[PDB]
């Protein structure tokens, strides 16, 4: 994961 998730918004 991250905090945002694998599926989330790019850093």
């Amino acid at each position: 994961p991250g905090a945002r998730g694998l599926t989330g918004r790019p850093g």
């Epitope: 994961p1 991250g2 905090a3 945002r4 998730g5 694998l6 599926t7 918004r9 790019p10 850093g11």
Partner: antibody, heavy 116, light 112 residues
Framework: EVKLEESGGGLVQPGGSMKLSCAAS????????MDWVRQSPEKGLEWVAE??????????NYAESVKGRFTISRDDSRSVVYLQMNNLKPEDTGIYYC???????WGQGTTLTVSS | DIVLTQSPASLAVSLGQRATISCRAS??????????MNWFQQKAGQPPKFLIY???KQGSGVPARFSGSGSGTDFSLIIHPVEEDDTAVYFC?????????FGGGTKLEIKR
């Protein structure tokens, strides 16, 4: 093991209110960004609302069709996300999924029927 | 809003064969060097299950027979070899920015 359980779905008359609740476990809740997504045969899958972690100031976002009506929030001490829905329309009918870590993990969902 | 348009609508593949499903976005989903395109499997009566992230990378526990490709506006999901349990609707989904949006879904039928 990740688990999300939604509750609080049911029947409501047009213009009424309802509060959905999402109990999450199996991951660091305070870090996760959480969302609500809904599904209907007419609209398909629509993202509804987002709430982010403490580091992003618990920032909320909403789909245009629910702004001013729906309010998302969270209790990090209890690992729960809420969705307060006001002024419900028939078009808000569908199955409402709670998702964690944006869309990595999904609950079984709860049904909302808006009708007279 | 970024609109995602899937093709084909449905599709029938024999066991052990390749299924290729496409997704065209109305604007680029590229941001900070990642193509923010995710794929989901929805089996009958179940919630969507997360398969692919960042166009081509595979989610934890997802079989190797699922894999995606693409960048910018054109993406696809490849399933090979197809098996009986892959009968499902597959959705593409974009996380480049708010509002997050989904494709309309594509139905994969297993031929027999």
């Amino acid at each position: 093991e990740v688990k999300l359980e939604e509750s609080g779905g049911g029947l409501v008359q047009p213009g009424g209110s309802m509060k959905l609740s999402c109990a999450a476990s199996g991951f660091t809740f305070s870090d996760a960004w959480m969302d609500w997504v809904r599904q209907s045969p007419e609209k398909g899958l629509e993202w509804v609302a987002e709430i982010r972690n403490k580091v992003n100031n618990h920032a909320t976002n909403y789909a245009e069709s629910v702004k001013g009506r729906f309010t998302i929030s969270r209790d990090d001490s209890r690992s729960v996300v809420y969705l307060q829905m006001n002024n419900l329309k028939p078009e808000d009918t569908g199955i409402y999924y709670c998702t964690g870590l944006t869309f990595d993990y999904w609950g079984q969902g709860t049904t909302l029927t808006v009708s007279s | 809003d970024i609109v995602l348009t899937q093709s084909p609508a449905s599709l029938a593949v024999s066991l052990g064969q390749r299924a290729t499903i496409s997704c065209r976005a109305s604007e680029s989903v590229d941001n900070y060097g990642i193509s923010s395109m995710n794929w989901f499997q929805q089996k009958a009566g179940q919630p969507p299950k997360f398969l692919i992230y960042a166009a081509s990378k595979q989610g934890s526990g997802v079989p190797a027979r699922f894999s995606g490709s693409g960048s910018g506006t054109d993406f696809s999901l490849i399933i090979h070899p197809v098996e009986e349990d892959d009968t499902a609707v597959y959705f593409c989904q974009q996380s480049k920015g708010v509002p997050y949006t989904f494709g309309g879904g594509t139905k994969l039928e297993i031929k027999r």
